[PDB]
């Protein structure tokens, strides 16, 4: 039996998850954590990365080849003065919308089936409250890899009946598609009881076990460790644990100093009230708070007493704590505050440092990052389905259309002129 | 008998539905849940999805063929200088309004008959308060599928007497229309007494039963489960349950400390008031609140008493709770606040993230999502009937009118010039 | 609302009449059942207001005299 210092299921960190999802502590700052765990933004960045890796592959060759196919199939032309640019622009729009809705249906189906592990919304807690994530690599029989291969083959059959160039792109990159699909169902966030993580004092190679079985873990911020056997975390929630404990103690104190002043006089020695009228309400109230005196024996000597009536004010440290939570979650992740003119907090949303700090290291330890890339934060406010329309616009897919536009305008301009 | 931790019909979550529809708690924020369960926006997005799936199908061929039909039926033409564009524009407007009112009558009939299951308004409660929906897959005899076929055939007979191009669109896609009509009446939201959901501790495969019958359920957020046998949820309403319980405790406390200070003096030892004139009113008032003393025996020793007069201030935590509720429902769903200049809260309405978070997973577990798409949030504020006029305008149905406009202007411009 | 089959239907003086349900209330082992309608969202608060109005009238009608004595 090795003496090993333990960190996870103590009071100091089991209380952290209760306060962080609000069993004990509450404030207006509690919302600024729940903005940080939108599990849709992970699937947005995931689809942005897989579509950006998808689209920039064969932008040069097939834009000539399928245009040659549709041109030799239908070379119909009346005049080369006005209608050529109109056919050009409706051509570009039709291609981009067809491959758009094709890969949009493909990514939408393969994500809406099995991207809802929703472990992001716990990953942010273990990256904000202890700085290191427990996770159990769930594996199954290898037949289920063939089952997922079957499912993504059915999805690209939907793409096959959608459009030929889209299914050409998916038949190009389905290998990495099924790779990131299996990496997506590869792990959980260790959301299970009787889990524990500890730091062995002889060799600081702190590792978790789940119910006796060793599990791996990704450490992002190892705590500082000294001759203080208990050890301080550098995590952002542990910056403010004392203050929110002070707040909840003040809430209990205010409740008990309210509940001990209910009666009008002091001596020494359930909607029942609403509906029922006042003539019996004054009857029920008088027995609802029984007058109780208070007494201790003393010989030849009684009190010269004093009375104190106060309630502790919550609004001062309430405004202080909400300001503390607000400026804290704006420093340690640079959330933006986009507003209109004289506009009051229209949106709080992820910015460039936030995705770099939480989403990209997440995909580092899911190891999907070998193919992916960050989404710019201006794109993240957009839609689930509109994001691709600017995503492959950011690639040279729509930039090659301008060059083939100039090539076609030269090709028929030397015909006309 | 298996020891299974139970979650649904306890105090902690049956009280959630009572506070959410306001049996116990109240605030100015309580409306911000009821804006989130507008059941008309689901049928809005549903009709947008089915009209978008309809209208992009045959935009290329039949616009030429039916114009050939109308041209060979009536090729009358006086001059090609001014009147050609006028006939062209009234032609395009008549086409779009005819198919508009055709599919509008079709979707209006098939929606107003059997889309008022209104289960969205309960789905948002089980997605906001426990993060998972119980639901019972209601099935019937297979004859009723032929009754629904009969109903949609009657609706397309109304389309038949409306317009032929709309009847061609519905005769093209009536199969998937029957699919979405069946999937719409496929399930309820498990709004029934004696329903229960629990989490089996031996394998965390939490499942619901209805009165002993096993039913499936869609989990969107697995709650955190530990050696704490009770488990904490990550949902929005459980983030603020304690604070509104504090509010209701203060409401009861203020009601008592108002109801116990009603008499003017204290010693130690129903509209019947309004109509009645004051001479008998002051008579009924004194017996309406009888003077009562209060007494406990003591020997050789009496009181040195003190008096307290206060009621708790409700407006401080009332403003605090409404602000908490407000910024809570603004972070966890990015509800927009569209306003005019110096305009105060003109509308709170669904934005891009909100439909992605609640409507699209709803249609994911109704499995209508294989044919549908999100409506952009700017369209959802528009009408039930005007929405399609922009919806197929977003498609190439009105964009192909510009190309056949240029084709007709070339076809008669080479005739005139 | 019939508890055996939730097929809630109205009658007029013993004669059955039809009804259009726009929002069926939620029903549980709570025999009284909660409505999802907007007026039931604020019923408790306006009952609190009317109780306060009665309370203010009766605490006005009990302070009308200038002096108060005991005996």
Residue numbers in the entry:
A (entry chain V), B (entry chain G): 52 to 320, 488 to 635
C (entry chain A): 250 to 320
Q: What is written in the article reporting this PDB entry?
A:
Here we present high-resolution structures of the A- and B-capsids and in-situ portals of human cytomegalovirus.
Notably, the C12 reconstruction of the B-capsid portal reveals that, among the cluttered scaffold densities surrounding the portal, 12 ordered density fragments tightly encircle the portal crown region. Each of the 12 ordered density fragments has comparable strength to that of the surrounding portal proteins and well matches a 15-residue-long loop-helix-loop motif. Previous biochemical data indicated that tryptophan residues in the portal of HSV-1 are essential to this portal-scaffold interaction. Consistently, we identified two tryptophan residues (Trp118 and Trp142) in the portal that participate in the interaction with the scaffold, and noted that these residues are conserved among herpesviruses. The present study shows that the portal of the B-capsid makes extensive associations with a protruded region of the middle band of the scaffold, which comprises the scaffold domain and 12 loop-helix-loop scaffold fragments that insert into the pockets of the portal crown domain. A portal structural comparison of the DNA-free and DNA-filled capsids shows that the scaffold fragment binding cavity of the portal is closed off in the virion capsid, suggesting that dissociation of the scaffold fragments from the portal is necessary for the required portal conformational changes during DNA translocation. Meanwhile, disengagement of the bound scaffold fragments from the portal would, in turn, release the restraint on the portal to allow for further conformational changes that are required for DNA packaging to proceed.
